[PDB]
Amino acid sequence: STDPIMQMLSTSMSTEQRLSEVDIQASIAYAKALEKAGILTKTELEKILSGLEKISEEWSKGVFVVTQSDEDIHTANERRLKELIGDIAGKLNTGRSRNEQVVTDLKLFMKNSLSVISTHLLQLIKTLVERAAIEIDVILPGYTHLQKAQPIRWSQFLLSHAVALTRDSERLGEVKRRINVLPLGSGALAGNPLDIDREMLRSELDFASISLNSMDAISERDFVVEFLSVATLLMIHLSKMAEDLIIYSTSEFGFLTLSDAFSTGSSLMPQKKNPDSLELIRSKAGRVFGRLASILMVLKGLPSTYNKDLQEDKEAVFDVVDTLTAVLQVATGVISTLQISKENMEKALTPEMLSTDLALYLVRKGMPFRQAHTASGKAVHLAETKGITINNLTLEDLKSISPLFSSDVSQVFNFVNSVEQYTAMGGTAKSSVTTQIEHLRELMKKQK
Amino acid sequence: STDPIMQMLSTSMSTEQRLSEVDIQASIAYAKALEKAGILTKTELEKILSGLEKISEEWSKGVFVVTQSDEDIHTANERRLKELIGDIAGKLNTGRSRNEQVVTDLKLFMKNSLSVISTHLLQLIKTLVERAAIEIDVILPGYTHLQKAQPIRWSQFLLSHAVALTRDSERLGEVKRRINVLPLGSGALAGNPLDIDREMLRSELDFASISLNSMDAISERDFVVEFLSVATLLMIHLSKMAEDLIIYSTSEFGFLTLSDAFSTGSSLMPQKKNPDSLELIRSKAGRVFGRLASILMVLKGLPSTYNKDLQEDKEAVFDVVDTLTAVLQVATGVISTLQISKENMEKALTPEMLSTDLALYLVRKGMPFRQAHTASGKAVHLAETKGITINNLTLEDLKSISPLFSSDVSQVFNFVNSVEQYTAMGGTAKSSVTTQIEHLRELMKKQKE
Amino acid sequence: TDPIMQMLSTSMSTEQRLSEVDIQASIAYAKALEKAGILTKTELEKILSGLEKISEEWSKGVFVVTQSDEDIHTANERRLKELIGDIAGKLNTGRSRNEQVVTDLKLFMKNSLSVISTHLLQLIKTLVERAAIEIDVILPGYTHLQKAQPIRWSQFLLSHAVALTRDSERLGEVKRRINVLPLGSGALAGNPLDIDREMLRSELDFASISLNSMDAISERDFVVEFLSVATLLMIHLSKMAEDLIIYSTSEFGFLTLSDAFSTGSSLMPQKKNPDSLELIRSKAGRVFGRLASILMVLKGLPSTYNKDLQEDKEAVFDVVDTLTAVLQVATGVISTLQISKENMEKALTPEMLSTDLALYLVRKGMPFRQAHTASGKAVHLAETKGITINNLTLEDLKSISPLFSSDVSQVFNFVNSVEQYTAMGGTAKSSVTTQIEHLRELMKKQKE
Amino acid sequence: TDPIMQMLSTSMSTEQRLSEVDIQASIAYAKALEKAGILTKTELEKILSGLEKISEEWSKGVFVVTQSDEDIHTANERRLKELIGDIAGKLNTGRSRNEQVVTDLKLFMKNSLSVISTHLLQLIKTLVERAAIEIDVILPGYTHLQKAQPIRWSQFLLSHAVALTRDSERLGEVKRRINVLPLGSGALAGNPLDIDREMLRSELDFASISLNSMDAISERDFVVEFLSVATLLMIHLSKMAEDLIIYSTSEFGFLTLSDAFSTGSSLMPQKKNPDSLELIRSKAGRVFGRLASILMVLKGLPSTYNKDLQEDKEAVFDVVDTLTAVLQVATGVISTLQISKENMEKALTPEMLSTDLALYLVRKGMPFRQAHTASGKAVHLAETKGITINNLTLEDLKSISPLFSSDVSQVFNFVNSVEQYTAMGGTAKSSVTTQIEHLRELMKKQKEQ
């Protein structure tokens, strides 16, 4: 008598389908552990193991026929097993609970998926890293408040993101260690009453460790939230980077031009590249954040142990996964094929940005901050009257404000020398840039 | 390194299809205006309209076929038309841009959907108000901090939920008006360049008004956001009821029990009844909410005019729309057929809940509030020391704490007389509940539309 | 009682700002109590006088808060009692902190939404006056942050003004549902002494009274609603802020902000930072966070009062103060930002007319695709010769299409380009004038 | 500059908290400044004198709130001159507000996460202890809020303490990524004075040094990350609050809160309102609201510094303050709540042993499907017989399945019930002990922060 429309809320069949593989693997591992408990005879086990496999192919070969009575995979499969092996299948459920499988199939699917995500994240970071190490010569303005601040290195920039993504990598792996904890063997909420070998289950499914509390493993979705968080953060980084490229791909900036493959245009206006790839990638941040926002609310205030509410997780996990997969691969392709403009980036470097280093001149020579700062104020002052680029002044004009000014001041008016000052660790100095490129190149080894 | 994957995001044929009809609706509405502009001859028009009608029917009969080249509906629709009418189809794309179709298709789809949700919503309240009238005599405990507070009427509780939902209906009405504004005619940024008849277009598609500023209309999604807001609140409203009945349906409470069609249970424990329905509904609060937060983020910080980021609204709207629809029907079903334990509700009421009424008894006899609180407080303790319920205290026992306690102090210990004190507007008194039911009936018909 | 638990449910810090309305409500109730018999003529007057003195103490800031004061209700009760004695006790008859919490917050909100309203209008009014004066100005129209086509500077401002006006509408609707008196709903079952709520609604100047005591005591739609609206309004100011910033870059050069709403250093005078716009853009998230919090506080909550409900205040107060400042700061930025016509004028280019050209073909009966195909060759050819579309010979045109008469020279005129759009809501001079009037009327109606 | 704009950044009230952390951030830079050859030993020690003086100003609470200054950076910059003359100015050189801002916060948070880490542990330890003490108490395990099966109250507390452990582990990973000095990264391109950032690290007690100046300035992961951990922690607590709140009801009557963490009335001395747990639950939203807000602030921002990044301090400051208060009230609630061994007992019913009964058959050899069926028969029989599953006699049981022997009586024992689950993680007395030891250990490894 179950209300038809009521099923419309708990009948995600299409969605369930992609958990079929993991379901079989759990049933199998379980069946094998079952025989070890005598609840199955070597014979039966083989019959069960076999049926499961024929199901796996039916899914792989996409020949598995779905039915109406099918609610979840657990039902779609078991119905199929009995269709093959017969009522001997009823044993496989001995001591087991839908509450166990639901979370077991999910941690599994997730473990694999994250693996694919990670690969792409690393490949995305790597791409940045190499590109940086290539164009270590290119220099362009550093923006603060989206206004020209000081001459910075192009590679320094590319890397800024690369370092922000590698932290995402560090967070992603961490979420993995907690996902790799086998929940199977927790029962409906009290544990397994048949004293099955949970440990045997662990190794069978390659899980790192085993759950600690049944009531917990049954109701907790921390593994879903924690994932969505790392995801959401990752998307923030990726969105900030899109904001930069989109802005830099603007005519007004002309710093760079995305590939046709990752952009849109028109025959009427050839000189017009629309950062389609970047924008979508920027928008997927809210799409992800949204998933996290949801689930967090689903869990809030929920009474202990299993509740039908915990069903909303599946659609959330798949969305983000598929979205991260693509968003990441597309990030790599946008970075790998986008062509820059060395002329534009350097042409964007105006002397006004060097006024700062001028103060560094006096101070390096001994003069206090205030006395070197006001000394530059006067410099740009009379540089306006004359109406000439700050670099083109008088050696006397300098010494007219403050004595300490000498013939060294001539160097202060150079970009490289301006960029080469931050030799310290982290600075945009080419030596620092190489150090970073070495730091990251290393990190990409430990996580392998 | 993925161009074809770049195409996997900005693509959604599975979802784009939900807009087949609306899309064709505007192409027809536009074509007609194009002819009125001279861009189309009377004969050219008739053919484009004939083509559009054929694609409309093709989708209807689920006999439409999309190719692996079809990006979105617009692309899959002008492909089939060109395949039916031929090169003549191009004339249609004259002047209008996709930015235009985007907001025109979603606003058209939403209009119809809101109307559905609206009707379903009205069925909940009606179901609620209606039962509130049929069970006006049932009395149970009213809570606070999930602690029994005082005798309240079952109808009162029901009507409180109905009232909160009414405001929902109202908010939806408002969303719908801003939604009933034709954006078609904004071009891709600065408007229609052919001076097309915007009014005639508003007429064909039947819209209340016409988009005020082209830049805005094309780059705005307030209608999406606002709808998701209204939807999220509606859901919180329902999560608060799911929570209420879930608890009231536990054996610990025993106030009511759902029907077999909206619940589940084990074979070995036939007494166990799990309120799945309510669980699902409550949980959708997060689902919907998620969508609201999602879109909100998308818009935040976005530069002026169209931006491919706005393509994330379709799935958000569709999800919430189907969700509210299902949830609202399942909502009505539950409240419609669930069983009430008039016995257990009346059994949960205790004499302790009347301690407040006792104090009040003294306040009507002219005794100051603070003084009556304490007077009722000593009667409680004394009864507690004697190990008996305050209603079993002796008139003498009471007079010892205050001579004012007269023989008529017994009417205080009557759960019916209790609720009967709140006859003021909104109160739980039989009179107040009746008037409330009259109000709602007038609002349900005030809303309607 | 615990000292730490009190550090969550005892905040005179924030609660104090409800002192006024709390008094205004206690007075109204006192009055209705007297008419009901609870109070005596001579008592009520003793209560009002004392109640009024408590107002003077707060407005003066002389009011002294005891260490045992938890909520404004206790503080003010305490005072009244020490100011009048026992009599003050009768003031609580048949009332509860529950109905006072909503009545106060709603009163506070009534005025607050008002103050926000007048500011939101001054901003809109401000945006419209500038679209009036600068009606001739023209700059590039953007899509994907790329130059799509010419548009009137006023069409821009108006687009933001038009969306900011939809907010005002929403704001008034929220205000209507807030304008309903919860006072007289008891602890959850309504008023026991049969208080005349009509007199109460009239005394406090509310539009009407609440229908269901339970609903009135436990609902917070007025808080959530106010929050949804505020968020969507900040979003509007966040998209506008974005536009301004990007426009205030040295790259775009479209305009710069007045010194009052920016920051900078004497070393790079030609560099100003839109702190104002940036702060405003960040406040979108500030406010959204507040919406999200309350939404989660209400989720799954069982009927009638629950302490969880006390999180609304701080949320309300924050938004009300945030919108109050943001709106004004925005208004300023807009009426004082210097715009460079020339720069916006130079931003206009030929390529941006290719569309206007294809249209020139269409108007001569030439079909859509054919015209688009023509313009293509028109742009491609001038692209091979090294010249701009507006400089290729008339015979040049004719080679692509014999429909190119000599009036094509009109197409190459930015003003002609905009005037093209006279269809309602377009960018043509008339349309902009029309918009102005409509918005001016909307504001006229919405004055009461 | 407009004063109104000043009210969107100026907030000494909120800035002040970073006062001391800023002084040390300076003391560190100064020392480094000297070794750079910018400040002479005489200057250094001098400057270091003013700072040490200022850090004592607010410390004891003597510092003067400059009605003209805003951030602490300017307040301290000022007051230093008011002590060490113009020399104080040279304490900036090569530095940047875009440095101290992050440096001052990681330090603050760093000292904060440590304190938070304590309270949390005290909670987990309080749960583990109480569980290990009432290992014998058995009560109903819930699912869909309906009685599912017998379970030990310890197995309950532990599931909460176990989840909390993951919060402690997550908070651990956070604190580490935060322990990376950002100082020496300039306003954008790094420190040009080639200062020794290693000296700074060792000086401020960090662990590592930012790898990219631009990143260290524009990134706010520590803020976001820490916000996410606190939110997941709160959800946990809210879930715990929900249970204990539901259990503290009259209907359930499983436990009662201490007067210290509750609220009541002189009228209803029984009725105990769980204000402590409700306030803890609501904080989930509050906290989540911070996470949400800062996520929207950072989303889409352009590279490097933007004034937008100024909303961090209030979110972090709030969450930190909340986590501290909440955690302590939690530890308080649990350790003082009075449990009803009795009521938890009467809550155990025979019907809840229908499954155990089926399992009995399973072990004896009978396959699952049959055992289940055989069990339902035993249920139906009892029904039509007017008794409970445990009153059916051996012959009654035999008439359903020969397998049922005289040992089947051992099934109708709620203790034996929970003893079936001995597998790793189950609710068997032994399994529970193991858990209690795992956690005592795990807490140790976490205590070594």
Short mmCIF file of all heavy atoms in Angstrom, two decimals, chain B residues 143 167 170 174 178 193 213-214 216 222 237 239-240 243-244 301 304-305 436, chain C residues 142 166 169-170 173 177 212 215 221 236 242-243 300-301 303-304 363 425 435:
data_model
loop_
_atom_site.label_atom_id
_atom_site.label_comp_id
_atom_site.label_asym_id
_atom_site.label_seq_id
_atom_site.Cartn_x
_atom_site.Cartn_y
_atom_site.Cartn_z
N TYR B 143 3.71 21.73 24.19
CA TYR B 143 5.07 21.73 24.70
C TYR B 143 5.84 23.02 24.66
O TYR B 143 5.33 24.06 24.27
CB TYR B 143 5.87 20.66 24.00
CG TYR B 143 5.35 19.29 24.29
CD1 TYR B 143 4.10 18.88 23.82
CD2 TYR B 143 6.08 18.42 25.08
CE1 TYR B 143 3.60 17.63 24.14
CE2 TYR B 143 5.59 17.17 25.41
CZ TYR B 143 4.35 16.78 24.94
OH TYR B 143 3.87 15.55 25.31
N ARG B 167 1.27 31.70 5.20
CA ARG B 167 2.24 32.73 4.90
C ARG B 167 3.07 32.21 3.73
O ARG B 167 3.46 32.96 2.84
CB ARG B 167 3.11 33.04 6.11
CG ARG B 167 2.35 33.65 7.28
CD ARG B 167 3.26 34.38 8.24
NE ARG B 167 4.05 33.45 9.02
CZ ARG B 167 3.57 32.76 10.06
NH1 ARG B 167 2.31 32.94 10.43
NH2 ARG B 167 4.34 31.89 10.70
N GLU B 170 1.25 32.85 0.52
CA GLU B 170 1.29 34.28 0.27
C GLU B 170 2.64 34.66 -0.38
O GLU B 170 2.67 35.25 -1.46
CB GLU B 170 1.05 35.02 1.60
CG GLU B 170 1.02 36.53 1.55
CD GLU B 170 0.22 37.15 2.70
OE1 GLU B 170 -1.01 36.87 2.77
OE2 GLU B 170 0.79 37.89 3.53
N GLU B 174 3.63 36.30 -4.25
CA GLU B 174 4.50 37.43 -4.55
C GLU B 174 5.61 37.02 -5.52
O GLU B 174 5.84 37.69 -6.52
CB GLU B 174 5.11 37.98 -3.24
CG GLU B 174 4.07 38.35 -2.16
CD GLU B 174 4.67 38.61 -0.77
OE1 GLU B 174 5.85 38.25 -0.54
OE2 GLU B 174 3.93 39.16 0.09
N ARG B 178 6.64 38.88 -9.75
CA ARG B 178 7.88 39.33 -10.34
C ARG B 178 8.25 38.33 -11.42
O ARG B 178 8.90 38.67 -12.40
CB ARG B 178 8.99 39.40 -9.31
CG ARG B 178 8.72 40.38 -8.23
CD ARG B 178 9.89 40.48 -7.29
NE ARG B 178 9.42 41.12 -6.09
CZ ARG B 178 8.64 40.53 -5.20
NH1 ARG B 178 8.28 39.26 -5.37
NH2 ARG B 178 8.14 41.21 -4.18
N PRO B 193 16.88 45.07 -31.51
CA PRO B 193 17.30 46.11 -32.46
C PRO B 193 16.32 46.37 -33.61
O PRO B 193 16.48 47.34 -34.36
CB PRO B 193 18.62 45.57 -32.96
CG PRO B 193 18.32 44.10 -33.09
CD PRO B 193 17.55 43.79 -31.80
N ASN B 213 14.58 46.93 -17.89
CA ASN B 213 15.91 47.26 -18.41
C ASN B 213 16.58 46.00 -18.97
O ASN B 213 16.84 45.05 -18.22
CB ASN B 213 16.76 47.84 -17.28
CG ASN B 213 18.19 48.16 -17.72
OD1 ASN B 213 18.58 49.33 -17.82
ND2 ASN B 213 18.98 47.11 -17.98
N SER B 214 16.90 46.00 -20.27
CA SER B 214 17.52 44.84 -20.93
C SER B 214 18.78 44.30 -20.24
O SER B 214 18.95 43.09 -20.09
CB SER B 214 17.86 45.16 -22.38
OG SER B 214 18.88 46.14 -22.44
N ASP B 216 19.59 44.44 -17.15
CA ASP B 216 19.11 43.68 -15.99
C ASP B 216 18.46 42.34 -16.32
O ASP B 216 18.98 41.30 -15.95
CB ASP B 216 18.12 44.49 -15.16
CG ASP B 216 17.54 43.69 -14.00
OD1 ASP B 216 18.31 43.39 -13.05
OD2 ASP B 216 16.33 43.35 -14.04
N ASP B 222 17.08 37.01 -9.84
CA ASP B 222 16.37 37.21 -8.60
C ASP B 222 15.20 36.23 -8.58
O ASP B 222 14.95 35.60 -7.56
CB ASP B 222 15.77 38.62 -8.49
CG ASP B 222 16.80 39.74 -8.40
OD1 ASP B 222 18.01 39.50 -8.59
OD2 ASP B 222 16.37 40.88 -8.13
N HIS B 237 9.35 24.98 7.43
CA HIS B 237 8.02 24.86 8.01
C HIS B 237 7.61 23.41 8.16
O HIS B 237 7.18 22.99 9.22
CB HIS B 237 7.01 25.63 7.16
CG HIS B 237 6.87 27.05 7.57
ND1 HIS B 237 6.29 28.02 6.77
CD2 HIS B 237 7.24 27.68 8.71
CE1 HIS B 237 6.31 29.18 7.41
NE2 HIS B 237 6.89 29.00 8.58
N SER B 239 9.69 20.81 8.02
CA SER B 239 10.63 20.01 8.81
C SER B 239 10.24 20.07 10.27
O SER B 239 10.54 19.16 11.05
CB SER B 239 12.05 20.56 8.70
OG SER B 239 12.19 21.74 9.47
N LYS B 240 9.58 21.17 10.64
CA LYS B 240 9.15 21.40 12.01
C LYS B 240 7.91 20.57 12.32
O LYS B 240 7.65 20.23 13.48
CB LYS B 240 8.90 22.91 12.21
CG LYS B 240 8.27 23.30 13.55
CD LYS B 240 8.41 24.80 13.91
CE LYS B 240 7.30 25.25 14.89
NZ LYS B 240 5.92 25.28 14.28
N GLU B 243 9.13 16.76 12.38
CA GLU B 243 9.69 16.61 13.71
C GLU B 243 8.54 16.43 14.71
O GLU B 243 8.56 15.48 15.49
CB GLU B 243 10.54 17.82 14.08
CG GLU B 243 11.19 17.77 15.46
CD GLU B 243 12.40 16.87 15.51
OE1 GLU B 243 12.74 16.25 14.49
OE2 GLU B 243 13.04 16.79 16.59
N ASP B 244 7.55 17.32 14.70
CA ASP B 244 6.45 17.17 15.64
C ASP B 244 5.77 15.81 15.60
O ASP B 244 5.69 15.12 16.62
CB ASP B 244 5.39 18.25 15.45
CG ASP B 244 5.72 19.53 16.19
OD1 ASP B 244 6.49 19.50 17.18
OD2 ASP B 244 5.17 20.58 15.78
N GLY B 301 29.19 38.46 -6.53
CA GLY B 301 30.41 38.97 -7.11
C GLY B 301 30.45 38.93 -8.63
O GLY B 301 31.43 39.37 -9.22
N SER B 304 28.65 42.55 -14.44
CA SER B 304 27.47 42.83 -15.22
C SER B 304 27.37 42.25 -16.61
O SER B 304 28.29 42.27 -17.44
CB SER B 304 27.18 44.34 -15.29
OG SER B 304 26.50 44.81 -14.14
N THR B 305 26.15 41.75 -16.79
CA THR B 305 25.59 41.13 -17.97
C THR B 305 25.73 39.65 -17.94
O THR B 305 26.15 39.07 -16.94
CB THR B 305 26.19 41.72 -19.23
OG1 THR B 305 26.40 43.12 -19.02
CG2 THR B 305 25.23 41.56 -20.40
N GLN B 436 -10.55 31.00 14.02
CA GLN B 436 -9.32 30.79 13.27
C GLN B 436 -9.67 29.98 12.03
O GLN B 436 -9.17 30.27 10.94
CB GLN B 436 -8.31 29.99 14.07
CG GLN B 436 -7.74 30.66 15.30
CD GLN B 436 -6.65 29.82 15.89
OE1 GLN B 436 -5.61 29.63 15.26
NE2 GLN B 436 -6.87 29.29 17.08
N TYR C 142 29.33 44.56 -21.75
CA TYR C 142 30.07 43.32 -21.59
C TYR C 142 29.31 42.00 -21.48
O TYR C 142 28.21 41.94 -20.96
CB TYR C 142 31.00 43.44 -20.39
CG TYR C 142 32.08 44.49 -20.53
CD1 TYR C 142 31.87 45.81 -20.13
CD2 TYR C 142 33.33 44.16 -21.08
CE1 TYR C 142 32.87 46.78 -20.28
CE2 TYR C 142 34.33 45.11 -21.23
CZ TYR C 142 34.09 46.42 -20.83
OH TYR C 142 35.08 47.36 -21.01
N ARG C 166 13.59 46.20 -7.17
CA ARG C 166 12.81 45.00 -6.93
C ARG C 166 12.99 44.65 -5.45
O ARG C 166 12.11 44.05 -4.84
CB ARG C 166 13.29 43.82 -7.80
CG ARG C 166 12.79 43.84 -9.23
CD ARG C 166 13.04 42.51 -9.88
NE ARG C 166 14.46 42.31 -10.12
CZ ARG C 166 15.12 42.77 -11.17
NH1 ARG C 166 14.47 43.46 -12.10
NH2 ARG C 166 16.42 42.55 -11.31
N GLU C 169 10.62 46.49 -3.18
CA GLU C 169 9.30 45.88 -3.26
C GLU C 169 9.23 44.74 -2.26
O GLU C 169 8.33 44.67 -1.44
CB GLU C 169 9.08 45.34 -4.66
CG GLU C 169 7.65 45.35 -5.07
CD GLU C 169 7.44 44.64 -6.38
OE1 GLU C 169 7.63 43.40 -6.41
OE2 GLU C 169 7.09 45.31 -7.38
N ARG C 170 10.21 43.85 -2.36
CA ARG C 170 10.33 42.71 -1.46
C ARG C 170 10.37 43.20 -0.02
O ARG C 170 9.71 42.64 0.86
CB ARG C 170 11.60 41.92 -1.79
CG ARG C 170 11.47 40.99 -3.00
CD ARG C 170 12.66 40.04 -3.11
NE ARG C 170 13.76 40.65 -3.84
CZ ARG C 170 13.89 40.63 -5.16
NH1 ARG C 170 12.98 40.00 -5.90
NH2 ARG C 170 14.91 41.25 -5.75
N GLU C 173 7.04 44.03 1.40
CA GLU C 173 6.19 42.84 1.62
C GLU C 173 6.57 42.18 2.93
O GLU C 173 5.72 41.72 3.69
CB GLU C 173 6.35 41.83 0.48
CG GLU C 173 6.46 42.46 -0.90
CD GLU C 173 6.47 41.44 -2.02
OE1 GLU C 173 7.13 40.38 -1.86
OE2 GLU C 173 5.85 41.70 -3.07
N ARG C 177 4.08 41.65 6.84
CA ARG C 177 3.89 40.45 7.66
C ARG C 177 4.55 40.58 9.03
O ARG C 177 4.28 39.79 9.93
CB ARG C 177 4.47 39.25 6.93
CG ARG C 177 3.45 38.57 6.05
CD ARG C 177 4.04 37.34 5.39
NE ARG C 177 5.04 37.73 4.42
CZ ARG C 177 4.76 38.11 3.18
NH1 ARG C 177 3.50 38.16 2.76
NH2 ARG C 177 5.74 38.50 2.37
N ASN C 212 -2.77 32.56 15.42
CA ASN C 212 -2.58 31.38 16.25
C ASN C 212 -1.48 31.60 17.28
O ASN C 212 -0.31 31.82 16.94
CB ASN C 212 -2.22 30.21 15.35
CG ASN C 212 -2.40 28.91 16.04
OD1 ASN C 212 -3.46 28.29 15.96
ND2 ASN C 212 -1.37 28.48 16.75
N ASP C 215 1.66 29.36 16.87
CA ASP C 215 2.44 29.82 15.73
C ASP C 215 3.13 31.14 16.03
O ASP C 215 4.30 31.33 15.67
CB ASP C 215 1.54 29.99 14.51
CG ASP C 215 2.23 30.77 13.40
OD1 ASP C 215 3.26 30.28 12.89
OD2 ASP C 215 1.74 31.87 13.06
N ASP C 221 9.60 33.48 10.70
CA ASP C 221 9.58 33.73 9.26
C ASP C 221 9.94 35.19 9.01
O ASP C 221 10.52 35.52 7.99
CB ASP C 221 8.18 33.50 8.66
CG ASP C 221 7.57 32.17 9.05
OD1 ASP C 221 8.29 31.31 9.57
OD2 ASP C 221 6.35 31.99 8.81
N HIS C 236 22.99 42.14 -5.07
CA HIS C 236 22.84 43.18 -6.09
C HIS C 236 23.97 44.19 -5.94
O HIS C 236 24.54 44.65 -6.94
CB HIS C 236 21.49 43.87 -5.93
CG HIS C 236 20.33 43.05 -6.40
ND1 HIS C 236 19.03 43.32 -6.04
CD2 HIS C 236 20.28 41.96 -7.21
CE1 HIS C 236 18.23 42.43 -6.61
NE2 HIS C 236 18.96 41.60 -7.32
N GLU C 242 31.44 44.79 -8.07
CA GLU C 242 32.33 44.11 -8.99
C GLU C 242 32.53 44.98 -10.22
O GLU C 242 33.67 45.29 -10.61
CB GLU C 242 31.70 42.77 -9.37
CG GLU C 242 32.44 41.98 -10.42
CD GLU C 242 33.54 41.10 -9.86
OE1 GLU C 242 33.71 41.03 -8.62
OE2 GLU C 242 34.24 40.48 -10.68
N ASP C 243 31.42 45.38 -10.84
CA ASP C 243 31.45 46.24 -12.01
C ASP C 243 32.25 47.48 -11.73
O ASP C 243 33.13 47.86 -12.51
CB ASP C 243 30.05 46.68 -12.41
CG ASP C 243 29.24 45.58 -13.00
OD1 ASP C 243 29.72 44.97 -13.98
OD2 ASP C 243 28.14 45.32 -12.49
N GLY C 300 14.07 21.27 11.61
CA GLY C 300 13.76 20.21 12.56
C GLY C 300 13.33 20.58 13.97
O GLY C 300 13.20 19.71 14.84
N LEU C 301 13.08 21.85 14.24
CA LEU C 301 12.67 22.20 15.59
C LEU C 301 11.22 21.90 15.95
O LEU C 301 10.31 22.34 15.25
CB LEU C 301 12.94 23.67 15.86
CG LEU C 301 14.35 24.14 16.18
CD1 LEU C 301 14.14 25.54 16.65
CD2 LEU C 301 15.06 23.32 17.27
N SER C 303 7.51 21.90 17.88
CA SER C 303 6.67 23.05 18.18
C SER C 303 6.82 23.80 19.48
O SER C 303 7.20 23.26 20.53
CB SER C 303 5.20 22.71 17.98
OG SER C 303 4.79 23.02 16.67
N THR C 304 6.46 25.07 19.33
CA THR C 304 6.44 26.14 20.31
C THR C 304 7.84 26.53 20.70
O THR C 304 8.80 26.06 20.11
CB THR C 304 5.65 25.77 21.56
OG1 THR C 304 6.21 24.60 22.14
CG2 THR C 304 4.19 25.54 21.19
N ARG C 363 17.72 44.75 -42.78
CA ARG C 363 16.69 45.74 -43.00
C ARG C 363 16.37 45.93 -44.48
O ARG C 363 15.33 46.51 -44.82
CB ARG C 363 17.10 47.06 -42.38
CG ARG C 363 17.22 47.00 -40.89
CD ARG C 363 17.12 48.37 -40.28
NE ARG C 363 17.09 48.29 -38.82
CZ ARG C 363 18.14 47.97 -38.07
NH1 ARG C 363 19.30 47.69 -38.64
NH2 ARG C 363 18.02 47.90 -36.75
N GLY C 425 12.69 49.06 -22.91
CA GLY C 425 13.75 48.55 -22.09
C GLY C 425 15.10 48.53 -22.77
O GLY C 425 16.08 48.10 -22.15
N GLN C 435 12.58 54.64 -18.74
CA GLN C 435 12.95 53.94 -17.52
C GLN C 435 12.97 54.90 -16.37
O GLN C 435 12.33 54.67 -15.35
CB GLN C 435 14.31 53.28 -17.69
CG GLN C 435 14.20 51.95 -18.41
CD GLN C 435 15.48 51.52 -19.06
OE1 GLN C 435 16.44 51.17 -18.38
NE2 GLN C 435 15.52 51.54 -20.39
#
